[PDB]
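Figure S7 source data.
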Amino acid sequence: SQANLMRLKSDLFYPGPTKDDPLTVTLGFTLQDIVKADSSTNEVDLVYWEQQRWKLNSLMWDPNEYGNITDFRTSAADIWTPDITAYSSTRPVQVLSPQIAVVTHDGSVMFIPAQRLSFMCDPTGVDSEEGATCAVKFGSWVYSGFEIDLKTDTDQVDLSSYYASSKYEILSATQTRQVQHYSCCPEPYIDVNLVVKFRERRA
Amino acid sequence: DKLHSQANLMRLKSDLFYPGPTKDDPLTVTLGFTLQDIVKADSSTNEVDLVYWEQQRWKLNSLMWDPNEYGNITDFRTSAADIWTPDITAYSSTRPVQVLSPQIAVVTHDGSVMFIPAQRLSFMCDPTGVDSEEGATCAVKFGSWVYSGFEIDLKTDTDQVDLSSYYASSKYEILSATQTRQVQHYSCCPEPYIDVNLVVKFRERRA
Amino acid sequence: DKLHSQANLMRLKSDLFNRYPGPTKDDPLTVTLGFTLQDIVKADSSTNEVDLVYWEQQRWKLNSLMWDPNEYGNITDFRTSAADIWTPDITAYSSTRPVQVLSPQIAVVTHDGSVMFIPAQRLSFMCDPTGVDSEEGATCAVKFGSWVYSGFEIDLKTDTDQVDLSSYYASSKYEILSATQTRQVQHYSCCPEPYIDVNLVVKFRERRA
Amino acid sequence: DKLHSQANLMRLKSDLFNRSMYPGPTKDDPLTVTLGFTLQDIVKADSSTNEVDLVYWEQQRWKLNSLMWDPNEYGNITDFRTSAADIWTPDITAYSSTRPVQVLSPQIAVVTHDGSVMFIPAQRLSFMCDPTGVDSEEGATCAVKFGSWVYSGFEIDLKTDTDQVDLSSYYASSKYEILSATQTRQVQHYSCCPEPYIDVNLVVKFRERRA
Amino acid sequence: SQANLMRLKSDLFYPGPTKDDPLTVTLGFTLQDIVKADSSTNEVDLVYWEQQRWKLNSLMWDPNEYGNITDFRTSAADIWTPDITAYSSTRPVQVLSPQIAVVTHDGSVMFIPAQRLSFMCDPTGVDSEEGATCAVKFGSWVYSGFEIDLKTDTDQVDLSSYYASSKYEILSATQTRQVQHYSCCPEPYIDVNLVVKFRERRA
Ligand SMILES: c1cncc([C@H]2CC3CCN2CC3)c1
Ligand SMILES: c1cncc([C@H]2CC3CCN2CC3)c1
Ligand SMILES: c1cncc([C@H]2CC3CCN2CC3)c1
Ligand SMILES: c1cncc([C@H]2CC3CCN2CC3)c1
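Tokens for the predicted 4VU complex:
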């Protein structure tokens, strides 16, 4: 089986998406913890898992040709991955988990990096019943909507793994598709907007 | 003589130098923690910083060799990047874990591998009660990030965290530290999932 | 047909890369610079340093990067790692920490041989924020230019003297009273040759909550 | 002539590297590393976390047969400098650091024709240390062991030249003054392994310096 | 034009200095800013440009054979560079500028990296009229005086680019060559000693 896997990988190992060969990446966010809210600089720090999924013809294989192998794990540097970027980060994003993706015989890839992000956020009112609200856009930095498209499986941020003893509780968190125009180029870019309303948790 | 033993080790490393575990070729990884120090308990962000040695042990057929065919060499040291290693991860870290020791593993002729990285970890933890008699209790799960229980099974030698190297003058004293294997099931998948749950009860040490 | 389009791109990239030593006095380069100011994160009066987040739009044109779209299936542009190509050494002349890169280091190349590179960056630079809590506010400046190329190898241009503020963080601790980007020419002790820079002048003030 | 010497060094380096290989020490071919510390500064002592930060130079010395050469055979070159990445280096590690060590100096070693290597990285280290009593006459006492992380005493042995830490470069205007600093060899056993491991124990007694 | 430069660089692209082939490095400091003076740890943070110059025969060429090229720019990683090091830094020095050098046809190299350095320094008196005085030595870490010699053009630090609105004003800054011995080796080591007297600037 080891030989089969090796052979498959060898046989497998695409210049990224193009206007003729567009790509749809599905984004989903799991919010694990709001670590810190700095009212002196208006930066908030999030820990979250960013689920990325996409599908490439060039990654399909017949499991029957490879000992019934239906999927495998490989370093994310072994394959192409989307340049999904936070548009209002204030520090470089920190990766908390192993950079390893899962590839299925149907040519779909799933890559779920855990990250810590500092982004621009005014925490004013976090100490009130209404809480504070902040938002950060996630999308390709260099690919327009014509090259890379984004969609979500749902507009509800997954909160099932949120840290129950965090300094902050989540009142709501959504994730929404957006189309933006920027001064630099004619073509529009796509992002998923993460909107979180949150409040200091009482002990 | 000494030149002959070097040649022997070189030939052995050449011959040995695996796509990782699979459902058909599963792997048991043994984890063990040696808790060295609780450096810091931040009640303003609810992060606690631990220093520990994380002992990982696994066994591969593809790393076996007959010692008599290589000058009685029973084991050797090699860079951790020369071999496959488990993607064991803390599930609730708040910053990238920091490695404090050389990334080198010990390989034994039976194919068993021992890898003990030293690490500093910030993880999610409410230190409420740390200043009390009963202390604070926090927990952090360690497991594979991308492998299920059908590819990587985890085991412990014991459920007692090794405290023989715990820093005696730490700001915090350990009341109890346990390491327990956990098997869980999720709706999304049929495969069982495994992790080792590190639970530490600690309080402020009196000077 | 899609496998053909991928092959075409691979062919184009292949031809261009496996075929530029940077600008010279004989073959000088004009780099256009534009700044998009996104946030003034912090102003530290203890050390006289200010931290900004901005997008640094860079454009230049290389004959060596030209291709005929018809010969390549109508590809008019492509994305490529900034490491696969030459990029200008545009540098802040008064930073106090290494610039932090916040965006993927990828450039866009068009068939006419022009490149567009827009790194998002956080920059700490020298700045006395005195008066930032006053009506007139505080003024600060930071020069941007090549570190090693003189005005003879690299010339700088702007498309406008007005910094793009259309993306400035509305709820920042600081608000922008004005922000300009202006071409300048300076001389240094080490070298006779002039160096060219774009001066970023920002007048800012504490935003009333 | 000068070109001749350059060529000679190149030839030598090439003979030693590209065409020689040393897999590290073993039970049959064990290595002895001489360790010495030049303590330069106690930068900070944090009583809230019990961490102390040291700046020091760590003099490492070992000798390999496979690095020996005949100077007469290479234009009388008796030594040379090379990137520490071109040769094997001991995995000498502090056993109680709380953060990754920070390297302050270029990672370049000196190789001598007898096969001896000298490597002296300057480092800043945060390690576990209770600084209670640092404001007393007696001062505070802390210790930290340095040893190979993965080699037992059967593969790597350690020794010092002297038990006296080199204090001739200690920063005279540091916040903290040194009352004594010793470096001592130790043999220890750890639960994971049967084999004993070797360390040099750096023990420092220090005190707040009066202005 | 581009072809000539490419040919030249290819033709050019030395194991470092030796006793039989020593090297003289000229050092010059341009002090731009004293960012911070920390009296709790006795560390001071400097921002400066460190001009390095040296000459290699093996980098010489005839401009006549190369389209009249008299100089070119190249990555500092393409050539040997001197391991000039602050002897009393307390943090890894941080490089603020692109690692690129200028090579001239006579074989002379000029390399001017901007750096931020924390180094050992008691800032006591910095709030007085006479100010505070600190020093830090710069030299090769591993080449003795028999392999690398150092020198300044002048003993006066270039203050022409010093930040006018720094928290600290410069009363004087000098750069002087020194010969020193260390316990580790019999051979002498060469350094250039940066001595700065400074005080808090009145607003
Ligand atoms: C093109 C190339 N590099 C960067 C971009 C930037 C510009 C701007 C920010 C996000 N993205 C599109 C909008 C476009
Ligand atoms: C030459 C080489 N390397 C760096 C430089 C620096 C020094 C000086 C200021 C900015 N820049 C141009 C002149 C020049
Ligand atoms: C064996 C392999 N890798 C690491 C070790 C560790 C365990 C323990 C701490 C330092 N070191 C030797 C003793 C042993
Ligand atoms: C020899 C080899 N490697 C480092 C050194 C150190 C020792 C000491 C400090 C700076 N440098 C020369 C003198 C010498």
